[PDB]
Amino acid sequence: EMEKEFEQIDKSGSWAAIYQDIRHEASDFPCRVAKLPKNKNRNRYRDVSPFDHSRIKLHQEDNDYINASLIKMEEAQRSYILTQGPLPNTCGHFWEMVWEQKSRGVVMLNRVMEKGSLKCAQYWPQKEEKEMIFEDTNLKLTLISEDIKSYYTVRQLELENLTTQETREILHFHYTTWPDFGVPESPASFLNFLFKVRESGSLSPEHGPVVVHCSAGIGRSGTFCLADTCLLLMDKRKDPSSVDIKKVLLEMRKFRMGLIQTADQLRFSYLAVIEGAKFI
Ligand SMILES: [Mg+2]
């Protein structure tokens, strides 16, 4: 079992060593488009770039670049787009990607401000009466409703392509209580949040891939996708104990670098998967 592997790493205090192992084994592919000078103001962090092979291309001829990666998990039959928190100048791009990729849900795992600094542009409208227009990509975004709970908020938004007047309902799942430092004490609220997203259909094959982000779109976002995939595979397989988190993580890392940013995020991911299997 992975509960036994978990208890072993804990008693021997080897989380740091296991995490470094994954870092060393992790795929490395080029990010040539990300690193072009014209795209410098499209990247929040210089050390977080999408691989060319798995990057999400915007459908425009001017500049198709956004810092976003398609993670395609063949066996689990899930896809996810992990991306950075939109910058002041890439909100229109962000919502372009939602539109073009046919996403139903956006999972946001950070607050706009943490540790006294801006981590993310205010990319969605906070009031029904004050809709946003992204002039560069010709999209209108409207808050339709908002349901605030203790650990998360879910918002319904209307995204309209202004060129064609088509509209869609996008669901915004905002986990609002991830601590400024470290990881949650218990994974219970994060699993509950994950189940809410699932229950909405936003992770399902009849929709485009869910868009997941934190500030950089590798740490907390990696945790969400890693836990989700691992749990799905345990449901699907003849032998549930054959699902190795380390292997799933390494497979995900073929599609975007850096997923799971600390040994503590790794530990937490184990905890979340173990507890998730218990409940279900
Ligand atoms: Mg109001």
Other C-beta atoms lying within 10 Å of the C-beta of residue 84: 26
Is 122 annotated in a binding site? The answer is no
Is 264 annotated in a binding site? The answer is no
What is the distance in A from the centroid of ligand 1 to the CA of 169? Answer: 19
What is the distance in A from the centroid of ligand 1 to the CA of 127? Answer: 5
Tokens of 143: 């808050």
What is the CATH number for 236? 3.90.190.10
For residue 234, how many C-alpha atoms fall within 13 Å in the half-sphere facing its CB? 21
What is the distance in A from the centroid of ligand 1 to the CA of 129? Answer: 7
Count of structural domains, the chain: 1
Cite the active site residues.
214
Sign of CA dihedral 200, 205, 208, 214: positive
Write b or e for each residue in 25-38: b if 16 or more Cβ atoms lie within 10 A of its Cβ, otherwise e.
ebeeeebebbeeee
Query: 170: which strand partners?
Result: 157
What is the distance in A from the centroid of ligand 1 to the CA of 157? Answer: 14
Rounded Cα distance, 226 and 219, in Å: 10
Rounded Cα distance, 118 and 173, in Å: 19
Rounded Cα distance, 253 and 88, in Å: 28
Rounded Cα distance, 92 and 55, in Å: 17
Is 47 annotated in a binding site? The answer is no
DSSP string, the chain: -HHHHHHHHHHTT-HHHHHHHHHHHS-----HHHHSGGGGGG-S-TT----GGGEEEPS-SS--EEEEEEEEETTTTEEEEEEPPPPTTSHHHHHHHHHHHTB-EEEE-S-SEETTEE-S---S-SSTTS-EEETTTTEEEEEEEEEE-SSEEEEEEEEEETTTTEEEEEEEEEE----SSS--S-SHHHHHHHHHHHHTTTTSTTSBPEEEESSSSSSHHHHHHHHHHHHHHHHH-S-GGG--HHHHHHHHTTTSTT-S-SHHHHHHHHHHHHHHHHH-
Do the beta carbons of residue 235 and residue 147 sit within 8 Å?
A: no
Q: In the chain, how long is the greatest CA-to-CA distance?
A: 60
Do the beta carbons of residue 56 and residue 83 sit within 8 Å?
A: yes
Q: Tokens 């991306």 correspond to what residue? A: 83
Instruction: Determine the residue type at 61.
Output: E
**Strand 210-213 with 78-83, pairing:** parallel
Is 261 annotated in a binding site? The answer is yes
Which residues lie below 8 Å from residue 172, measured CB to CB, with a gap of 6+? 105, 106, 108, 124, 153, 154, 155, 156, 157
Instruction: Determine the residue type at 134.
Output: F
Please give the distance of CA 62 from its chain centroid, rounded to a whole number: 26
Specify the resolution in Å.
Answer: 2.3
Tokens of 76: 């689990």
Rounded Cα distance, 61 and 264, in Å: 42
> Measured between alpha carbons, how far is residue 91 from residues 64, 88, 140, 208, 237 in Å?
14, 6, 11, 19, 40
Polymer length of the chain: 280
Which residues lie below 8 Å from residue 57, measured CB to CB, with a gap of 6+? 64, 65
Q: Which domain holds residue 22?
A: 1-280
Is 85 annotated in a binding site? The answer is no
What is the distance in A from the centroid of ligand 1 to the CA of 125? Answer: 11
